[PDB]
């Protein structure tokens, strides 16, 4: 038996988040994003950025004392894409390679029951 947290990855397009919490969620540990590392403003969603972020997050988790982590991976959801972005795979590989242990994995993208009209209009986003 080891000590656990939850990673709570949000792999949108356009950025990534990796921020670990306690089992409750109120206690937050080691929040980092892909845009904090790279300074290009468009590679924020890149797997390299997600890997660097997860390396930092795992270092902070080891410093505080955290050995294992459950994973709740997420996309934007709602009325938007509800398909996870590129950084999720990268971050998972990263903080699996980086000493931490991986408990259970779950996809927690917020899905509606057909609510709240999407953005773009009727004819859609054109070009």
């Amino acid at each position: 038996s080891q000590v656990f947290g939850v990673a709570r990855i949000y792999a949108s397009f356009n950025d990534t988040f990796v921020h670990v919490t306690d089992l409750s969620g109120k206690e937050t540990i080691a929040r980092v994003t892909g845009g904090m590392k790279v300074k290009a403003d468009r590679d924020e969603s890149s797997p390299y950025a997600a890997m660097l972020a997860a390396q930092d997050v795992a270092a902070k988790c080891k410093e505080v004392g955290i050995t294992a982590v459950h994973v709740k991976i997420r996309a934007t959801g709602g009325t938007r894409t509800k398909t996870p972005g590129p950084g999720g795979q990268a971050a998972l590989r990263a903080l699996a390679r980086s000493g931490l242990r991986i408990g259970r994995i779950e996809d927690v993208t917020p899905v509606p029951s057909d609510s709240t009209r999407k953005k773009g209009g009727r004819r859609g986003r054109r070009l």
Partner: protein
């Protein structure tokens, strides 16, 4: 240049007696000083944890359970049941094309003053010699089945309290009961209680709480 993990205090979470094992987890809260003591910061917390983890059997790899913190005994708090939910992966694996889905809800009160909405689900099945693809129900069978499930859930609540209810939900006896009651209406695979959620609590009943120790 403060590094609040100098002050954030490692702390334990113990589950009630009625799953299998109590040593659930460890949280971090803060150092309990004047001006926001820790026992008022950590008393509303909830903890979503897998029934596989707190029962030992991977058969409950789904069925996440929310436990809501209620008390403290010296870095060793005991918690209580707040809800049960299935996982998205299991729902979306169940939900297949070319069959009819049946959902039932009921708001019911226990023999104590706990009120709760309990959500069951079922899916039609194909009866083992069947040539056609689709296995749909009429839309009168469906309402018959919904009525049956509602009756069963209502009579299996206001029996005993949350303790015995959780003891029923864990080994999934209600599911077999629904199957037996719906033998004669429609076949019905994948019978489950998708959710049980609390919406009104009684007045804190520390006897019934602290009667969940070792």
């Amino acid at each position: 240049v403060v590094d609040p993990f100098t002050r954030k205090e490692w702390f334990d979470i113990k589950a009630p007696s009625t799953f299998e094992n109590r040593n659930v987890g460890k949280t971090l809260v803060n150092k309990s000083t004047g001006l926001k003591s820790a026992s008022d910061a950590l008393k509303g917390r909830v903890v979503e944890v897998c029934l596989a983890d707190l029962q030992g059997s991977e058969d409950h790899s789904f069925r996440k359970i929310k436990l809501r913190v209620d008390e403290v005994q010296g870095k060793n708090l005991l918690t209580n049941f707040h809800g049960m939910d299935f996982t998205t992966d299991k729902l979306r694996s169940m939900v297949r094309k070319w069959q009819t889905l049946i959902e039932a809800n009921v708001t019911v009160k226990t023999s104590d003053d706990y009120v709760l909405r309990i959500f069951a689900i079922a899916f039609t099945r194909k009866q083992a010699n069947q040539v056609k693809r689709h296995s749909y129900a009429q839309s009168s069978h469906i309402r018959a089945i919904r009525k049956v499930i509602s009756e069963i859930l209502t009579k299996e609540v206001q029996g005993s309290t949350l303790a015995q209810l959780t003891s029923k939900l864990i080994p999934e006896v209600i599911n077999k009961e629904i199957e037996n009651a719906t033998k004669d209406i429609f076949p019905l695979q994948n019978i489950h209680v998708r959710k049980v959620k609390l919406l009104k609590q009684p007045k804190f009943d520390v006897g019934a709480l602290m009667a969940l120790h070792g």
